[PDB]
Design a protein around this nucleic acid. Sequence first.
DNA 1: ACGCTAGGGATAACAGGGTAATAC
DNA 2: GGTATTACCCTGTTATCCCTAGCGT
Length: 226
Amino acid sequence: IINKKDLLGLGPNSKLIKDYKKQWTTLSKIQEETLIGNILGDVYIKKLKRNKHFLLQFEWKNKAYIEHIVRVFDEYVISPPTLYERKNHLGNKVITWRAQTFEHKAFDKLGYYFMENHKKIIKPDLVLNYITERSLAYWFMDDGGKWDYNKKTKNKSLVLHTQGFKKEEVEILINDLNIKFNLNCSIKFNKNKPIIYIPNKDYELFYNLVNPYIIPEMKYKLLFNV
DNA sequence: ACGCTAGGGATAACAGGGTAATAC
DNA sequence: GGTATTACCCTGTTATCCCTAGCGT
Ligand SMILES: [K+]
Ligand SMILES: [K+]
Ligand SMILES: [K+]
Ligand SMILES: [K+]
């Protein structure tokens, strides 16, 4: 009946760790739907030749946000989030927070579903069979944006930053999102790569779908003047 | 003058892989 | 006393979210 407390600082190949893992086989509904959003967003779902099952590597600027994600996947995360400071070619110090799950079979289904030749890809049935409003909220906290950053604007158009996907992949998302959630998303380009524009007249709908899941430190991505 | 949005910046992501601690 | 495992930590690189100049109105 192994407590995770005890795994803290043990060498990777410790028996206690392998015995701890069998206390879990599949992601919860909540974890699965969260994680579908995060994969579309900011999470690395990682399996190289060296890895026996998928794990997650987490990296965010926002401290409250990474600590929230770690609580959702609490079981799978041994060590707390760690501040990392890097110098960049400009010579400026950059701060982020980092966390990792261990490898675990529970991550394999979504790992094989999303990753193909070490690229994230959009499966033709992703939207229909997997994306819920919980998934949409996480995708939005990760990769979400305003069309108009003027603080006093009346234009409440929003963006999902899908630059890393293929045009034809984003066209699938837009088509299936508009059928499943009755949105009027349309495609646009940012540095010649595809993004999802959510028009102003979808704002009340989108808000009412995702706002229930948005944590207090992420409401700003969604909030305009009334 | 003002509302929108295409063009572009320095990160804030996303990645891939080295190091070193248990099991035999 | 190699060899297999593998959590944590280190290094590469840039497409991101975010900002704003400038055009149509
Ligand atoms: K992404
Ligand atoms: K992001
Ligand atoms: K960035
Ligand atoms: K990026």
